[PDB]
Amino acid sequence: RSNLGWLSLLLLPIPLIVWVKRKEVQKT
Amino acid sequence: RSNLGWLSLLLLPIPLIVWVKRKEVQKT
């Protein structure tokens, strides 16, 4: 009995990893 | 009919990061 709301929850957490890369990678 | 559509939009953007790794190579 999979809930429609639960699939939606999954998309919000992966985008966070992309944001860290823009700030930097190791230095300049 | 409106709010449901927005959650779907969020998933397409992260998958893009995975694709660059598949490309491999380097020349930037």
Next chain:
Amino acid sequence: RSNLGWLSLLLLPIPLIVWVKRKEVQKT
């Protein structure tokens, strides 16, 4: 155009790449 079920499929595969990053493989 795409089915409602298809958008849900897209969220499940991106989470996997982040786990790989924690492992931190050689080279790359």
